[PDB]
Ligand binder design. Sequence first.
Ligand SMILES: Nc1nc2c(ncn2[C@@H]2O[C@H](COP(=O)(O)OP(=O)(O)NP(=O)(O)O)[C@@H](O)[C@H]2O)c(=O)[nH]1
Ligand SMILES: [Ca+2]
Ligand SMILES: [Mg+2]
Ligand SMILES: [Mg+2]
Length: 166
Amino acid sequence: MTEYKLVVVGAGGVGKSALTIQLIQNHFVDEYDPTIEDSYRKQVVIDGETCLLDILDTAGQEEYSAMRDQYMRTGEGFLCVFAINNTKSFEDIHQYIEQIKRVKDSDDVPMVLVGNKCDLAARTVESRQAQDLARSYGIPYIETSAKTRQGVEDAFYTLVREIRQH
Ligand SMILES: Nc1nc2c(ncn2[C@@H]2O[C@H](COP(=O)(O)OP(=O)(O)NP(=O)(O)O)[C@@H](O)[C@H]2O)c(=O)[nH]1
Ligand SMILES: [Ca+2]
Ligand SMILES: [Mg+2]
Ligand SMILES: [Mg+2]
């Protein structure tokens, strides 16, 4: 059984915890409790193979930026999340990737760029704008809603594939 170490990263309130919790636990967290750092673990079959997903729910608040370095070393693949109604989080996520590539000293780090909250109509990040950013990194772009589960399995499982195809 292969184990995959996924880390979910991005700015505060973009839906990292709701995305993780929707995948692992199949419900939507409506309330907003900022995360320090939580861990989840779950046995899944992906492309015929049983594997263990280890998922680190990280902090979006800047006050815990200090602990980013240590989880960027451990993690095998990184789900890079912004909210399509939050232009600042799209600008920010660009920064998170550069930090990962730095900390890991590779421009070949398994990653998926995720535009979350795609159920909201207050979109200020157009899909083409995120596509352009993903293209420059060689990584997939996938839109999701943690509310409706749209794209949630696809996003996380794409990241496993990126890691396992690394
Ligand atoms: N409509 C909608 N709301 C969402 C979605 N994902 C998260 N939210 C909402 O946005 C708020 C913040 O979500 P949360 O997952 O806690 O964000 P976070 O990125 O983990 N924040 P932190 O970095 O502080 O831990 C919550 O009220 C949650 O219900 C989504 O896909 N759609
Ligand atoms: Ca709920
Ligand atoms: Mg959270
Ligand atoms: Mg615009």
